[PDB]
Amino acid sequence: TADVQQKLAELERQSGGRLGVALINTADNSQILYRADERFAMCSTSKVMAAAAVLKKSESEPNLLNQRVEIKKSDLVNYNPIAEKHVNGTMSLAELSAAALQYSDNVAMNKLIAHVGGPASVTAFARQLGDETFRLDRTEPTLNTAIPGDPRDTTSPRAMAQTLRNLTLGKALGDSQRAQLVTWMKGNTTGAASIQAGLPASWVVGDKTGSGGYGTTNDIAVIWPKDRAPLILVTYFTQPQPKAESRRDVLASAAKIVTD
Ligand SMILES: *[B@@]1([O])O[C]([C]C([O])=O)[C]=[C][C][C]1[N]C(=O)[C]C1=[C][C]=[C]S1
Ligand SMILES: [Cl-]
Numbered sequence: 498t499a500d501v502q503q504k505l506a507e508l509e510r511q512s513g514g515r516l517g518v519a520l521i522n523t524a525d526n527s528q529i530l531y532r533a534d535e536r537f538a539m540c541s542t543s544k545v546m547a548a549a550a551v552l553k554k555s556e557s558e559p560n561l562l563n564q565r566v567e568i569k570k571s572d573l574v575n576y577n578p579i580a581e582k583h584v585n586g587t588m589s590l591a592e593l594s595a596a597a598l599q600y601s602d603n604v605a606m607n608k609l610i611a612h613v614g615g616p617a618s619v620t621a622f623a624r625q626l627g628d629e630t631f632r633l634d635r636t637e638p639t640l641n642t643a644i645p646g647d648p649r650d651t652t653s654p655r656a657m658a659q660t661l662r663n664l665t666l667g668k669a670l671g672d673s674q675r676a677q678l679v680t681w682m683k684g685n686t687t688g689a690a691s692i693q694a695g696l697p698a699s700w701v702v703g704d705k706t707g708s709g710g711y712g713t714t715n716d717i718a719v720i721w722p723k724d725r726a727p728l729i730l731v732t733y734f735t736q737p738q739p740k741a742e743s744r745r746d747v748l749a750s751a752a753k754i755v756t757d
Contacts, residue, residue, distance in 0.1 A: 538643035540707030580604035630656035641709030695752030712741025
């Protein structure tokens with residue numbers, strides 16, 4: 498709809514920030530796009546690509562997810578909800594992936610990054626999939642600075658929607674690995690006020706949120722509406738003031754506009 502475009506523009510205006518939306522509707526292979534080719538800081542939405550890279554690696558190393566990783570005090574960063582419970586012990590790569598995806602643990606993300614060879618290796622994995630837009634430049638916590646004009650740790654809504662579709666509904670990952678990614682995303686604990694908040698209660702959602710400087714507030718989701726083909730939705734939002742507050746409501750509103 499041109500109506501949908503007008504409503505998204507209205508939402509953006511009211512919000513004071515910059516909104517990026519990409520919806521893929523697998524029912525009819527249509528898209529709804531708003532600033533979908535602009536770059537936005539991914540913040541923790543990048544953790545999907547890092548977990549996917551480990552899942553890919555596990556297809557040629559079948560006991561990889563059980564591999565143990567030491568957690569030390571020196572690993573702690575700014576937000577360690579799961580890793581702080583495991584200091585001086587080990588977590589498996591499966592546990593780290595779950596912590597990164599479901600609690601947005603930042604130590605967990607740094608262990609996924611390190612395992613696969615660093616930010617440039619996560620980026621090369623994206624390229625191998627056909628995503629030529631995604632770039633992961635830094636580790637946690639600095640990858641979330643979200644400075645306007647800074648291309649580090651950014652992607653576009655279009656690219657991220659196409660990539661999430663490939664990862665969750667397509668064939669980027671083997672069936673076991675794809676199912677594990679989907680299960681992890683469906684068990685997310687951080688997204689109930691974001692895309693989920695703009696959809697009917699009966700719909701099933703797997704999502705990953707992100708937040709960072711400049712009031713950056715993000716969510717990427719695979720959605721199974723009741724008796725419908727699935728949708729992929731990326732909603733990215735960022736604001737002009739360095740210390741702007743979170744605006745999860747804006748993502749909920751965008752989700753409601755594009756699925757109404
Ligand atoms: B990451 O972006 O994911 C979130 C998800 C959310 O808010 O729903 C929460 C915690 C980990 C992430 N965010 C941050 O680390 C915030 C910042 C880090 C450095 C500067 S701001
Ligand atoms: Cl409802």
